[PDB]
Specification:
Pfam families: Acyl-CoA_dh_1, Acyl-CoA_dh_M, Acyl-CoA_dh_N. InterPro entries: Acyl-CoA_Oxase/DH_mid-dom (IPR006091), Acyl-CoA_Oxase/DH_mid-dom_sf (IPR046373), AcylCo_DH-like_C (IPR036250), AcylCo_DH/oxidase_C (IPR009075), AcylCoA_DH/ox_N (IPR013786), AcylCoA_DH/ox_N_sf (IPR037069), AcylCoA_DH/oxidase_NM_dom_sf (IPR009100). By secondary structure, this protein is of the alpha+beta class. It folds into 3 domains: 125 residues, Butyryl-Coa Dehydrogenase, subunit A, domain 1, CATH 1.10.540.10; 94 residues, Beta Barrel (Butyryl-CoA Dehydrogenase, subunit A, domain 2), CATH 2.40.110; 151 residues, Butyryl-CoA Dehydrogenase, subunit A, domain 3 (Up-down Bundle), CATH 1.20.140.10. 52% of the residues lie in helices and 13% in strands. The protein contains 12 helices and 8 strands.
Amino acid sequence: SNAMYDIYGEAALPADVRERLRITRDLAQAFHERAPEHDRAGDFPFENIEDLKASGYVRWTVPVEYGGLGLSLEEMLMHQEVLAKGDGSTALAIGWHVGILLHLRETGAFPDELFRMVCESVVKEGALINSCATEPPETTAVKVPGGYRITGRKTFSTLSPALTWIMVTATVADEDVVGQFLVRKEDVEIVETWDTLGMRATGSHDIVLKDVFVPEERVIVIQRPGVQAERRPDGSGWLLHIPACYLGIALAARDFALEYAATYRPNTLPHPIAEVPHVEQKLGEMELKLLAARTLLYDLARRFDAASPEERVKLQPQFGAVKTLATNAANQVVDLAMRVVGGRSLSRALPLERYYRDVRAGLHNPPMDDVVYRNLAKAALARRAAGQ
């Protein structure tokens, strides 16, 4: 409908979306120019995060009533894909923030007052938020006067150096029930762990909580019998930000290889390499993998936007399918782009090798391909059973 304007034309886009796309294309260009040194040094891109805050991007998924733009999931994915073309690490990291805010808006998982407080901090100060549940729940909350003390360790928190707020799960000691708590980043220790193949600018950090106080008003939920989670489910649709980011990296690789192929004419040939038959085939195959994966991504995002909570839950198997298709397609596209360019694709003078490293992580984000396929099979069997 709006998405894939690069294929289908920008003339059809409403003036507000075109203006927002000018903003995110501008950001992407700056991220692109900065990406090589951040990848080489593996240093966190704080200036990119400052640009995102200054632009207003960080509040676009906050509801209109609290001073955001209430952006649709379809449009959020479009901008994620634009930002990722510039720099995968930065896009994916801020995706967790704009996405989690879309998740909270669509579910009412936060108490009203707490959501209002967080939304105000995002709108007025550009405060950033992420949810950090995974560990190397071992993380523990102890009830104290006024709230809880939290001790533990969470892992893979990619935006953490720039966060203000952190949603963390912990087991309440001596009730054996799990809670979620809104922790201030300034109260935790960010610890560097091993560096990684790609996405190296944002790096891998653990968050360490020793003796962290959460007052009662920043308790999100305690999962007892009866409560129990979120006012209305969303089927985790917001997790489409992940495949959006990997497709944007693939698009950068494609744009690169197309540009190269159009303009590189070796002295062994009378035409550019874009006209060599096996190069045409590789470029055409890249186009088709992108067309198929992006079309499905945006189709599911639009269905999400239009769907009730009950329907959103039923879309989950297809949401997984998108993730598998996009992240696989993105790795294949980068492979083909490198084969088009040839031996120079190995050189750190060109960005393709960085794309080859960065794109790989999509395959190892949950849900794994084997889980996605199993879930598709089970949904197919459930649909057959319901039919009769």
